[PDB]
Design an enzyme around this catalytic site. Structure first.
Site, PDB file in Angstrom:
ATOM      1  CG  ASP A   1     -61.006 -33.871  -4.337  1.00 24.36           C
ATOM      2  OD1 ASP A   1     -62.093 -34.256  -4.822  1.00 24.36           O
ATOM      3  OD2 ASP A   1     -60.931 -33.016  -3.426  1.00 24.36           O
TER       4      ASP A   1
ATOM      5  CG  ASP B   1     -57.254 -30.468  -2.829  1.00 23.16           C
ATOM      6  OD1 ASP B   1     -56.544 -31.170  -2.074  1.00 23.16           O
ATOM      7  OD2 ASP B   1     -58.460 -30.211  -2.579  1.00 23.16           O
TER       8      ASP B   1
HETATM    9  N1  B31 Z   1     -75.720 -37.412  -3.595  1.00 21.39           N
HETATM   10  C1  B31 Z   1     -74.315 -37.426  -3.209  1.00 21.39           C
HETATM   11  C2  B31 Z   1     -74.001 -37.595  -1.737  1.00 21.39           C
HETATM   12  C3  B31 Z   1     -72.894 -38.542  -1.354  1.00 21.39           C
HETATM   13  O1  B31 Z   1     -72.917 -38.654   0.012  1.00 21.39           O
HETATM   14  C4  B31 Z   1     -71.543 -38.028  -1.789  1.00 21.39           C
HETATM   15  O2  B31 Z   1     -71.180 -38.158  -2.964  1.00 21.39           O
HETATM   16  N2  B31 Z   1     -70.677 -37.368  -0.808  1.00 21.39           N
HETATM   17  C5  B31 Z   1     -69.378 -36.818  -1.209  1.00 21.39           C
HETATM   18  C6  B31 Z   1     -68.274 -37.142  -0.239  1.00 21.39           C
HETATM   19  C7  B31 Z   1     -67.024 -36.447  -0.695  1.00 21.39           C
HETATM   20  N3  B31 Z   1     -65.888 -36.827   0.146  1.00 21.39           N
HETATM   21  C8  B31 Z   1     -67.222 -34.946  -0.737  1.00 21.39           C
HETATM   22  O3  B31 Z   1     -66.015 -34.310  -1.093  1.00 21.39           O
HETATM   23  C9  B31 Z   1     -65.902 -33.001  -0.619  1.00 21.39           C
HETATM   24  O4  B31 Z   1     -65.496 -32.983   0.723  1.00 21.39           O
HETATM   25  C10 B31 Z   1     -64.070 -33.332   0.922  1.00 21.39           C
HETATM   26  C11 B31 Z   1     -63.718 -33.230   2.349  1.00 21.39           C
HETATM   27  N4  B31 Z   1     -64.596 -33.890   3.281  1.00 21.39           N
HETATM   28  C12 B31 Z   1     -63.207 -32.439   0.087  1.00 21.39           C
HETATM   29  O5  B31 Z   1     -61.811 -32.721   0.357  1.00 21.39           O
HETATM   30  C13 B31 Z   1     -63.554 -32.615  -1.276  1.00 21.39           C
HETATM   31  O6  B31 Z   1     -62.677 -31.857  -2.139  1.00 21.39           O
HETATM   32  C14 B31 Z   1     -64.956 -32.249  -1.532  1.00 21.39           C
HETATM   33  N5  B31 Z   1     -65.274 -32.571  -2.929  1.00 21.39           N
HETATM   34  C15 B31 Z   1     -68.317 -34.589  -1.700  1.00 21.39           C
HETATM   35  O7  B31 Z   1     -68.520 -33.186  -1.714  1.00 21.39           O
HETATM   36  C16 B31 Z   1     -68.944 -32.723  -2.928  1.00 21.39           C
HETATM   37  O8  B31 Z   1     -67.999 -31.881  -3.510  1.00 21.39           O
HETATM   38  C17 B31 Z   1     -68.465 -30.539  -3.392  1.00 21.39           C
HETATM   39  C18 B31 Z   1     -67.434 -29.709  -2.793  1.00 21.39           C
HETATM   40  O9  B31 Z   1     -66.271 -29.577  -3.541  1.00 21.39           O
HETATM   41  C19 B31 Z   1     -69.668 -30.573  -2.565  1.00 21.39           C
HETATM   42  O10 B31 Z   1     -69.369 -30.341  -1.220  1.00 21.39           O
HETATM   43  C20 B31 Z   1     -70.155 -31.906  -2.735  1.00 21.39           C
HETATM   44  O11 B31 Z   1     -70.959 -31.986  -3.879  1.00 21.39           O
HETATM   45  C21 B31 Z   1     -69.587 -35.341  -1.350  1.00 21.39           C
HETATM   46  O12 B31 Z   1     -70.582 -35.146  -2.316  1.00 21.39           O
HETATM   47  N1  ANP Z   2     -52.117 -22.364  -5.188  1.00 20.98           N
HETATM   48  C1  ANP Z   2     -53.438 -21.774  -5.205  1.00 20.98           C
HETATM   49  N2  ANP Z   2     -53.746 -20.822  -6.096  1.00 20.98           N
HETATM   50  C2  ANP Z   2     -54.963 -20.254  -6.106  1.00 20.98           C
HETATM   51  N3  ANP Z   2     -55.912 -20.603  -5.240  1.00 20.98           N
HETATM   52  C3  ANP Z   2     -55.668 -21.558  -4.311  1.00 20.98           C
HETATM   53  C4  ANP Z   2     -54.414 -22.175  -4.285  1.00 20.98           C
HETATM   54  N4  ANP Z   2     -54.429 -23.080  -3.286  1.00 20.98           N
HETATM   55  C5  ANP Z   2     -55.637 -23.053  -2.695  1.00 20.98           C
HETATM   56  N5  ANP Z   2     -56.394 -22.131  -3.318  1.00 20.98           N
HETATM   57  C6  ANP Z   2     -57.790 -21.818  -2.970  1.00 20.98           C
HETATM   58  O1  ANP Z   2     -58.108 -22.341  -1.703  1.00 20.98           O
HETATM   59  C7  ANP Z   2     -59.120 -23.388  -1.879  1.00 20.98           C
HETATM   60  C8  ANP Z   2     -58.727 -24.550  -1.096  1.00 20.98           C
HETATM   61  O2  ANP Z   2     -57.463 -25.135  -1.349  1.00 20.98           O
HETATM   62  P1  ANP Z   2     -57.398 -26.712  -1.348  1.00 20.98           P
HETATM   63  O3  ANP Z   2     -55.974 -27.083  -1.716  1.00 20.98           O
HETATM   64  O4  ANP Z   2     -58.380 -27.284  -2.366  1.00 20.98           O
HETATM   65  O5  ANP Z   2     -57.862 -27.057   0.131  1.00 20.98           O
HETATM   66  P2  ANP Z   2     -58.085 -28.391   0.927  1.00 20.98           P
HETATM   67  O6  ANP Z   2     -57.289 -28.264   2.251  1.00 20.98           O
HETATM   68  O7  ANP Z   2     -57.571 -29.548   0.116  1.00 20.98           O
HETATM   69  N6  ANP Z   2     -59.704 -28.456   1.326  1.00 20.98           N
HETATM   70  P3  ANP Z   2     -60.653 -29.361   0.195  1.00 20.98           P
HETATM   71  O8  ANP Z   2     -60.613 -28.677  -1.240  1.00 20.98           O
HETATM   72  O9  ANP Z   2     -62.057 -29.376   0.715  1.00 20.98           O
HETATM   73  O10 ANP Z   2     -60.103 -30.799   0.057  1.00 20.98           O
HETATM   74  C9  ANP Z   2     -59.149 -23.675  -3.328  1.00 20.98           C
HETATM   75  O11 ANP Z   2     -60.370 -24.117  -3.748  1.00 20.98           O
HETATM   76  C10 ANP Z   2     -58.815 -22.370  -3.917  1.00 20.98           C
HETATM   77  O12 ANP Z   2     -59.898 -21.558  -3.952  1.00 20.98           O
HETATM   78 MG    MG Z   3     -59.817 -28.575  -2.980  1.00 21.79          MG
HETATM   79 MG    MG Z   4     -58.390 -31.298  -0.714  1.00 18.25          MG
END
Ligand code: B31
Ligand code: ANP
Ligand code: MG
Ligand code: MG
Length: 263
Positions: free
Chosen positions: A189, A207
């Site tokens: 990711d 992550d």
């Molecule tokens: N025109 C594009 C639309 C298409 O549906 C698509 O690519 N859709 C994607 C789907 C993808 N799974 C999203 O990931 C995001 O949601 C996940 C959980 N459901 C997180 O675990 C992940 O880390 C995060 N990147 C992404 O979001 C993008 O990442 C950004 C956030 O970090 C923002 O939310 C968005 O830009 C989004 O654009």
């Molecule tokens: N070890 C760390 N050190 C500093 N900041 C952290 C750390 N872990 C998490 N964070 C913060 O918390 C946010 C989320 O953690 P993350 O591991 O990316 O969550 P997640 O459960 O995977 N949700 P997502 O990012 O949407 O997939 C990160 O974007 C950072 O801002």
């Molecule tokens: Mg994350």
């Molecule tokens: Mg994550």
């Protein structure tokens, strides 16, 4: 009942002020633990996600394996407690990339950083990498998630302009049009909020539940997606490939972007 964390884990963190992380939309819970001399992070997933790339235990394994290979948090404690997988880790070094560099102001630097991630990842020896995130593996987990109502199927996938009308239609594409895979270390990711920078260099990755062996185009595709979404100007996508020294494979790039749709 009783607690989600063990008595020993609670003992470890009781001196800390717990602050719940708001920006983060996965099934994991993330808590910032504010102490006198440092912050820790505690990340937890429930049993429904055991074995998937959301599994905090799988993230813990990769975090340990990556020590000395990529800058990552230190694993301080892991446990399974009453269904829950709990990971206590140190705070990453540096500044969250999304916070250090904004898309309007430092486009070339951002491109440069992403490119350096790819290069770094390609230098990592995956001989004894704990997990292989082959498409068969990812597809098997996506099938499991869909069957059990655990995938990210809501919201933008309801819009009438969606390339596929429902999740199984997307799933079918992914299942039947798998591209060739050449395995390397993959973050899983790669995005500006899972990466830290310091002194203009990458200083930490977080992550990591989805990291492991995967095709090289997987992370590259995530970079393309980020550049187009955050910056938009296609010039910068072309620049990114100029830094990589390769021509894009739009078929593979499109594929992996679609793969992440339901996660
Ligand atoms: N025109 C594009 C639309 C298409 O549906 C698509 O690519 N859709 C994607 C789907 C993808 N799974 C999203 O990931 C995001 O949601 C996940 C959980 N459901 C997180 O675990 C992940 O880390 C995060 N990147 C992404 O979001 C993008 O990442 C950004 C956030 O970090 C923002 O939310 C968005 O830009 C989004 O654009
Ligand atoms: N070890 C760390 N050190 C500093 N900041 C952290 C750390 N872990 C998490 N964070 C913060 O918390 C946010 C989320 O953690 P993350 O591991 O990316 O969550 P997640 O459960 O995977 N949700 P997502 O990012 O949407 O997939 C990160 O974007 C950072 O801002
Ligand atoms: Mg994350
Ligand atoms: Mg994550």
């Amino acid at each position: 009942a009783k607690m989600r964390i063990s008595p020993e884990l609670k003992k470890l963190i009781e001196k800390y002020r717990c602050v719940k992380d708001t920006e983060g939309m996965s099934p994991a819970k993330v808590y910032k633990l504010v102490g006198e001399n440092e912050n820790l992070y505690l990340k937890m997933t429930d049993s429904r996600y055991k074995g998937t790339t959301y599994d905090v235990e799988r993230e813990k394994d990769m975090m340990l394996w990556l020590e000395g290979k990529l800058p990552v948090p230190k694993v301080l404690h892991f446990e399974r407690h009453d269904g829950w997988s709990n990971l206590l880790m140190s705070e990453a070094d540096g500044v969250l990339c999304s916070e250090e560099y904004e898309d309007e102001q430092s486009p070339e630097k951002i491109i440069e950083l992403y490119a350096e991630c790819i290069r770094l990842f390609h230098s990592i020896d995956i001989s004894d990498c704990p997990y292989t995130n082959s498409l068969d593996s990812r597809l098997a987990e996506l099938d499991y998630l869909l069957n059990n109502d655990l995938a990210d199927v809501d919201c933008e996938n309801w819009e009438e302009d969606t390339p596929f009308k429902d999740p199984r239609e997307l799933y079918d594409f992914l299942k039947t049009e798998k591209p060739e895979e050449e395995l390397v270390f993959s973050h899983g990711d790669l995005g500006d909020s899972n990466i830290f920078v310091k002194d203009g260099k990458v200083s930490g990755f977080i992550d990591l539940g989805r990291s492991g062996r995967a095709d090289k185009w997987y992370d590259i595709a995530f970079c393309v997606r980020s550049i187009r979404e955050d910056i938009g100007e296609e010039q910068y996508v072309e620049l990114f490939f100029d830094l990589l020294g390769i021509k894009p494979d739009w078929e593979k790039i499109k594929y992996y972007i679609l793969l992440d749709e339901l996660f």
